[PDB]
Design an enzyme around this catalytic site. Sequence first.
Site, short mmCIF file in Angstrom:
data_model
loop_
_atom_site.label_atom_id
_atom_site.label_comp_id
_atom_site.label_asym_id
_atom_site.label_seq_id
_atom_site.Cartn_x
_atom_site.Cartn_y
_atom_site.Cartn_z
N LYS A 11 0.61 -1.13 0.17
CA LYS A 11 -0.10 -0.04 -0.43
C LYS A 11 1.02 1.60 -0.23
O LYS A 11 1.36 1.41 0.85
CB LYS A 11 -0.59 0.27 1.40
CG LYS A 11 -1.64 -1.16 1.04
CD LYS A 11 -2.52 -0.88 2.67
CE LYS A 11 -3.31 0.11 2.56
NZ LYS A 11 -4.54 0.39 1.31
N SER A 31 14.96 9.60 -7.91
CA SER A 31 15.12 8.15 -7.16
C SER A 31 16.84 7.97 -6.31
O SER A 31 17.53 8.59 -6.47
CB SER A 31 15.32 7.42 -8.28
OG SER A 31 15.61 5.97 -7.56
N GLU A 61 8.49 14.32 3.72
CA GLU A 61 9.63 13.60 3.73
C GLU A 61 10.25 13.68 3.08
O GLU A 61 12.11 13.73 2.46
CB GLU A 61 9.45 11.98 3.90
CG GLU A 61 8.83 11.62 5.37
CD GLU A 61 7.94 10.42 5.65
OE1 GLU A 61 7.89 10.02 6.43
OE2 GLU A 61 8.84 9.75 5.00
N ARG A 81 5.19 -4.77 -9.95
CA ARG A 81 6.29 -4.64 -8.07
C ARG A 81 5.34 -4.82 -6.76
O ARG A 81 5.09 -4.84 -6.15
CB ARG A 81 6.45 -2.96 -7.99
CG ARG A 81 7.60 -2.53 -9.32
CD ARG A 81 9.19 -4.05 -9.53
NE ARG A 81 9.74 -4.19 -8.48
CZ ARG A 81 10.16 -4.30 -7.97
NH1 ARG A 81 10.53 -5.54 -9.24
NH2 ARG A 81 11.36 -4.97 -6.65
N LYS A 125 8.62 4.15 -14.89
CA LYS A 125 8.07 4.25 -14.64
C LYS A 125 7.01 4.57 -14.96
O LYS A 125 5.85 5.34 -14.91
CB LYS A 125 7.92 5.74 -13.11
CG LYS A 125 9.34 5.50 -12.08
CD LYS A 125 8.91 4.48 -11.55
CE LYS A 125 9.30 4.28 -10.16
NZ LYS A 125 11.42 4.19 -9.83
O1 YUT Z 1 8.27 4.56 -2.72
P1 YUT Z 1 8.74 3.09 -2.08
O2 YUT Z 1 7.50 2.50 -2.58
O3 YUT Z 1 9.36 3.18 -0.64
O4 YUT Z 1 10.11 2.62 -3.33
C1 YUT Z 1 10.68 2.22 -2.85
C2 YUT Z 1 11.03 1.15 -2.72
O5 YUT Z 1 10.37 0.29 -1.74
P2 YUT Z 1 10.45 -0.15 -0.02
O6 YUT Z 1 10.37 0.82 0.52
O7 YUT Z 1 11.39 -0.86 -0.26
O8 YUT Z 1 8.64 -1.12 0.33
C3 YUT Z 1 10.68 -0.18 -3.99
O9 YUT Z 1 10.57 -1.40 -4.15
P3 YUT Z 1 10.16 -2.31 -4.27
O10 YUT Z 1 9.30 -1.71 -5.56
O11 YUT Z 1 9.12 -1.55 -3.41
O12 YUT Z 1 10.55 -3.72 -4.19
C4 YUT Z 1 12.09 0.74 -4.99
O13 YUT Z 1 12.01 0.40 -6.25
P4 YUT Z 1 12.90 -0.53 -6.71
O14 YUT Z 1 13.31 -1.52 -5.68
O15 YUT Z 1 14.71 0.45 -7.19
C5 YUT Z 1 12.09 -1.12 -8.61
F1 YUT Z 1 10.79 -0.62 -8.77
F2 YUT Z 1 12.80 -2.51 -8.67
P5 YUT Z 1 13.19 -0.23 -9.50
O16 YUT Z 1 12.70 1.72 -9.64
O17 YUT Z 1 14.80 -0.32 -9.70
O18 YUT Z 1 13.19 -0.71 -11.12
C6 YUT Z 1 11.84 2.72 -5.23
O19 YUT Z 1 12.68 3.14 -5.90
P6 YUT Z 1 12.56 4.40 -6.53
O20 YUT Z 1 13.03 5.74 -5.82
O21 YUT Z 1 13.34 3.04 -8.24
O22 YUT Z 1 11.20 3.98 -7.31
C7 YUT Z 1 12.07 2.94 -3.45
O23 YUT Z 1 11.56 4.53 -4.01
P7 YUT Z 1 12.37 5.09 -3.17
O24 YUT Z 1 14.17 4.57 -2.10
O25 YUT Z 1 13.13 6.57 -3.68
O26 YUT Z 1 11.85 5.54 -2.25
CL CL Z 2 4.97 2.88 -10.17
F F Z 3 9.13 6.24 2.90
MG MG Z 4 9.35 8.02 1.49
MG MG Z 5 7.89 5.99 3.76
#
Ligand code: YUT
Ligand code: CL
Ligand code: F
Ligand code: MG
Ligand code: MG
EC number: 3.6.1.52
Length: 134
Positions: A11, A31, A61, A81, A125
């Site tokens: 979510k 990113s 944030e 994803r 994206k």
């Molecule tokens: O916004 P979020 O949902 O937090 O997304 C956060 C993570 O999620 P989590 O914090 O590990 O749950 C993304 O990982 P998933 O795509 O959910 O595996 C990240 O995705 P990645 O694992 O890198 C991916 F989707 F596989 P890619 O973008 O390499 O194709 C996401 O990175 P992005 O910035 O590229 O969206 C990160 O964002 P950030 O580190 O800037 O917060």
């Molecule tokens: Cl997305």
């Molecule tokens: F976050």
């Molecule tokens: Mg965040």
């Molecule tokens: Mg967060």
Amino acid sequence: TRTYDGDGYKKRAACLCFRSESEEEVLLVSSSRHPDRWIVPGGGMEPEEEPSVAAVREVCEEAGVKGTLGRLVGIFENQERKHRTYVYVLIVTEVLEDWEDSVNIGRKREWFKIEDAIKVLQYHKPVQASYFET
Ligand SMILES: O=P(O)(O)O[C@H]1[C@@H](OP(=O)(O)O)[C@H](OP(=O)(O)O)[C@@H](OP(=O)(O)C(F)(F)P(=O)(O)O)[C@H](OP(=O)(O)O)[C@H]1OP(=O)(O)O
Ligand SMILES: [Cl-]
Ligand SMILES: [F-]
Ligand SMILES: [Mg+2]
Ligand SMILES: [Mg+2]
Ligand SMILES: [Cl-]
Ligand SMILES: [Mg+2]
Ligand SMILES: [Mg+2]
């Protein structure tokens, strides 16, 4: 703490952070995993957190902005994803100089004309580019 819908999709909440009520320029952030790529600021909802609250919190944030929360645009799935994101309009009224992700990870932010935001989101994206289709 990551949270999930009943189908196991993570979510999330995000805002389209517009410079004004004319919704012509939007704020994107870099990113964290890939800093030469742009994304829409957003992230995971916490337990029992309202989506609108998560959206405003994540924009503060990640982007260092506050403003007037508007409409829910829609709920968007990323099938690859396995995440589901509530996307809101936010009209930015405050731009803070040194915000959580600037301090901690050197996250960048930039204003884009809507058509340019769509262009830079399309490659990695495409679901976020589709946030702007409505
Ligand atoms: O916004 P979020 O949902 O937090 O997304 C956060 C993570 O999620 P989590 O914090 O590990 O749950 C993304 O990982 P998933 O795509 O959910 O595996 C990240 O995705 P990645 O694992 O890198 C991916 F989707 F596989 P890619 O973008 O390499 O194709 C996401 O990175 P992005 O910035 O590229 O969206 C990160 O964002 P950030 O580190 O800037 O917060
Ligand atoms: Cl997305
Ligand atoms: F976050
Ligand atoms: Mg965040
Ligand atoms: Mg967060
Ligand atoms: Cl604008
Ligand atoms: Mg996150
Ligand atoms: Mg995030």
